[PDB]
Amino acid sequence: GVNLEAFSQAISAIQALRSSVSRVFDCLKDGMRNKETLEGREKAFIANFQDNLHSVNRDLNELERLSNLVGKPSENHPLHNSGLLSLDPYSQLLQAYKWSNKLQYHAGLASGLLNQQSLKRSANQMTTLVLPPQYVDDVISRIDRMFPEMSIHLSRPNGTSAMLLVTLGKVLKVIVVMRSLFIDRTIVKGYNESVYTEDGKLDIWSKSSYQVFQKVTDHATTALLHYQLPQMPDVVVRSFMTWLRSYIKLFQAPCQRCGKFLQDGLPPTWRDFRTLEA
Amino acid sequence: RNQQLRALQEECDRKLITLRDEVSIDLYELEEEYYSSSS
């Protein structure tokens, strides 16, 4: 697994294991300059001694470590070394192996700091923001279905615009009827109250529920109207899907008791809590 | 014959929707255009 990175911290740990004892003897390198207030200075010595206990903690750190070992030792890395002398002038690639990573890592910061944009204007510098091809919808559908344990379906019986339905662990399916590219004008229900497979005769609208999911529907509409980025509609629908995923539990109830109202949910901050409080 | 005329309206209906679609595009194509006027 990825627990190997934990060993990195362990490295720093044993580093202190050295420094600690140095900080001990350095503290013994000189005596009382001028206490004049108390004799805790000597205790200060023992204070450094206390940090030596940290070393024992290092031994404890190995209890959580050693999850399991992976097969095929050496992880296909030194296979290039098995080549003849002709292959040895190849380490460069391995360097790039880190470099590329750094690249990503650099972007990992850069893109992050790209969040604070400076686009004083976005028009009068040019188009067709509505996606022409009726194939990018299927692309977005497949990208969403790439997510596990969350099934998505779509029929689009109305026309050019997009129509889709999504289901989760509960029967709280969500019907989203939006334009070509970005999600807008959706609704949610629960327990066959919509039944948008063959409701009456087709995927009906019915604009209703028993006064429980209505707040969730309004919040999802707000999230759709708020996450409408100027570009990258795929990012928009992915953010929408991630937001929708946050209701798969409906179990916790922080910053209040589980008796304030019918339910509780408003996670635009990537964390749900008691509703009617933000 | 009924089935026949069914098609006669069915595609027609679709055509209307297609019209709407086009109109919708045109609709949008003018909405931003409505923004420009600083009257």
Swiss-Prot record, chain A:
Pfam family for this entry, one: Med27
Tree of life domain: Eukaryota
GO biological process, alphabetically ordered: positive regulation of transcription elongation by RNA polymerase II; positive regulation of transcription initiation by RNA polymerase II; protein ubiquitination; regulation of transcription by RNA polymerase II; RNA polymerase II preinitiation complex assembly; somatic stem cell population maintenance
Subcellular location, principal: nucleus
A single cellular component GO annotation: nucleolus
Residue positions, PTM Phosphoserine: S118
Keyword Membrane in annotation: no
Residues with PTM N6-methyllysine: K120
Keywords for the protein's UniProt record, in alphabetical order: Activator, Methylation, Nucleus, Phosphoprotein, Transcription, Transcription regulation
Oligomer status and interactors: Component of the Mediator complex, which is composed of MED1, MED4, MED6, MED7, MED8, MED9, MED10, MED11, MED12, MED13, MED13L, MED14, MED15, MED16, MED17, MED18, MED19, MED20, MED21, MED22, MED23, MED24, MED25, MED26, MED27, MED29, MED30, MED31, CCNC, CDK8 and CDC2L6/CDK11. The MED12, MED13, CCNC and CDK8 subunits form a distinct module termed the CDK8 module. Mediator containing the CDK8 module is less active than Mediator lacking this module in supporting transcriptional activation.
Functional summary from the UniProt entry: Component of the Mediator complex, a coactivator involved in the regulated transcription of nearly all RNA polymerase II-dependent genes. Mediator functions as a bridge to convey information from gene-specific regulatory proteins to the basal RNA polymerase II transcription machinery. Mediator is recruited to promoters by direct interactions with regulatory proteins and serves as a scaffold for the assembly of a functional preinitiation complex with RNA polymerase II and the general transcription factors.
Name assigned to this protein: Mediator of RNA polymerase II transcription subunit 27
Provenance organism: Mus musculus (Mouse)
UniProtKB/Swiss-Prot annotation, chain B:
Subunit structure: Component of the Mediator complex, which is composed of MED1, MED4, MED6, MED7, MED8, MED9, MED10, MED11, MED12, MED13, MED13L, MED14, MED15, MED16, MED17, MED18, MED19, MED20, MED21, MED22, MED23, MED24, MED25, MED26, MED27, MED29, MED30, MED31, CCNC, CDK8 and CDC2L6/CDK11. The MED12, MED13, CCNC and CDK8 subunits form a distinct module termed the CDK8 module. Mediator containing the CDK8 module is less active than Mediator lacking this module in supporting transcriptional activation.
Organism: Mus musculus (Mouse)
Coiled coil: 1-22
Name the UniProt record assigns to this protein: Mediator of RNA polymerase II transcription subunit 22
Lineage: Eukaryota, Metazoa, Chordata, Craniata, Vertebrata
Compartments in which it is found: Nucleus
Residues shown, of full length: 101 to 139 of 200
Domain of life: Eukaryota
Similarity remark: Belongs to the Mediator complex subunit 22 family.
Signal sequence extent: none
The protein's role, per its UniProt record: Component of the Mediator complex, a coactivator involved in the regulated transcription of nearly all RNA polymerase II-dependent genes. Mediator functions as a bridge to convey information from gene-specific regulatory proteins to the basal RNA polymerase II transcription machinery. Mediator is recruited to promoters by direct interactions with regulatory proteins and serves as a scaffold for the assembly of a functional preinitiation complex with RNA polymerase II and the general transcription factors.
